[PDB]
Amino acid sequence: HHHHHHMRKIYIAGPAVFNPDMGASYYNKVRELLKKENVMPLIPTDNEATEALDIRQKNIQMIKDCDAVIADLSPFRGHEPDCGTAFEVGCAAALNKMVLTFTSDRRNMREKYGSGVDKDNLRVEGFGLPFNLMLYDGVEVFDSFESAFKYFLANFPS
Amino acid sequence: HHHHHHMRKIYIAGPAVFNPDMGASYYNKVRELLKKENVMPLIPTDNEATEALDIRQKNIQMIKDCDAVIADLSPFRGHEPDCGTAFEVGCAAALNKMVLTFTSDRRNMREKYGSGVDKDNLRVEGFGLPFNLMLYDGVEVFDSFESAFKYFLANFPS
Numbered sequence: 001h002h003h004h005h006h007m008r009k010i011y012i013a014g015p016a017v018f019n020p021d022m023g024a025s026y027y028n029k030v031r032e033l034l035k036k037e038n039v040m041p042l043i044p045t046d047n048e049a050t051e052a053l054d055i056r057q058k059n060i061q062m063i064k065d066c067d068a069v070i071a072d073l074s075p076f077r078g079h080e081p082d083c084g085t086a087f088e089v090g091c092a093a094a095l096n097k098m099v100l101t102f103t104s105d106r107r108n109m110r111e112k113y114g115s116g117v118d119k120d121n122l123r124v125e126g127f128g129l130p131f132n133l134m135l136y137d138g139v140e141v142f143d144s145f146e147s148a149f150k151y152f153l154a155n156f157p158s
Numbered sequence: 159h160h161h162h163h164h165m166r167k168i169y170i171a172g173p174a175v176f177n178p179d180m181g182a183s184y185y186n187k188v189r190e191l192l193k194k195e196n197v198m199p200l201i202p203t204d205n206e207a208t209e210a211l212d213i214r215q216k217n218i219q220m221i222k223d224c225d226a227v228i229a230d231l232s233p234f235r236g237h238e239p240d241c242g243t244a245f246e247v248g249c250a251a252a253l254n255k256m257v258l259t260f261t262s263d264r265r266n267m268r269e270k271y272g273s274g275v276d277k278d279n280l281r282v283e284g285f286g287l288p289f290n291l292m293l294y295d296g297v298e299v300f301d302s303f304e305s306a307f308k309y310f311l312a313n314f315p316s
């Protein structure tokens with residue numbers, strides 16, 4: 001009776017932070033969706049510090065503390081995902097965390113670039129994946145935050 | 159007495175793999191530089207597999223095996239570093255590996271973009287750093303592979 005109960009936690013990785021509203025609209029939708037399932041969002045801008053290294057360390061700690069990462073690997077400033085988000089996905093992988101990814105554009109890299117090379121003749125990967133192969137770990141690439149969250153609920157029960 | 163001797167190893171992270179020559183010219187220079195100090199380069203294309211997941215897993219294992227990562231965070235397809243490289247830097251950070259970075263362009267992000275926002279009004283970070291703040295851990299951002307390697311030799315002796 002009255003045993004400790006773990007509250008599930010998801011790190012909310014993605015470039016929403018660079019939106020004009022600093023991600024408010026995105027994060028508010030995330031907060032509302034997760035609240036219904038008693039899941040805590042760990043959001044990059046929470047209790048934000050002023051120094052770069054402190055912001056970084058707090059985000060790494062959120063990844064260490066999380067049960068899963070849901071990462072927005074949508075195109076950012078071109079066809080490639082955000083590198084900060086990629087760093088966080090790498091952190092999560094090394095820590096053996098559940099990593100779930102989605103993107104607004106699921107086409108293969110070569111379809112995105114329209115060729116096996118970019119405008120500067122640099123090679124575009126040909127593995128039938130929507131982004132750099134380091135970012136794919138065998139879990140389905142989802143089409144939305146919500147679809148990724150459904151996988152979380154099915155595969156990480158309370 | 160013939161005790162075991164550790165050979166130092168550096169993971170060679172960066173988008174050279176996408177050069178037309180698949181990074182041969184870059185990796186050859188790395189090999190020659192490291193050979194002089196009896197340091198082993200762990201190069202992403204070594205013993206390369208055919209399946210994406212296998213290539214990824216082998217690269218993660220190289221990061222686990224390394225003493226340091228030297229990461230080329232130069233602009234790739236714009237002002238941002240390569241996301242694969244960023245993933246690898248995050249992997250190394252989570253594993254408490256020495257991470258050393260360089261770039262061909264050390265200007266602050268806002269200098270690179272010429273503004274506090276990009277062409278689509280998305281926020282450009284203002285922390286006096288050359289790239290996404292997750293990629294900076296307090297070690298100097300070097301100007302070349304060689305300068306990073308000099309730091310390695312000074313700070314990770316045989």
Ligand SMILES: Cn1c(=O)ccc2ccccc21
Binds near residue numbers: 055
């Ligand atoms: C601006 N900013 C934040 O305000 C919070 C987290 C964060 C992480 C990576 C890059 C930039 C970030």
Ligand SMILES: Cn1c(=O)ccc2ccccc21
Binds near residue numbers: 132
């Ligand atoms: C094409 N390719 C390789 O051939 C080898 C490693 C690797 C790592 C990330 C992304 C692409 C890669």
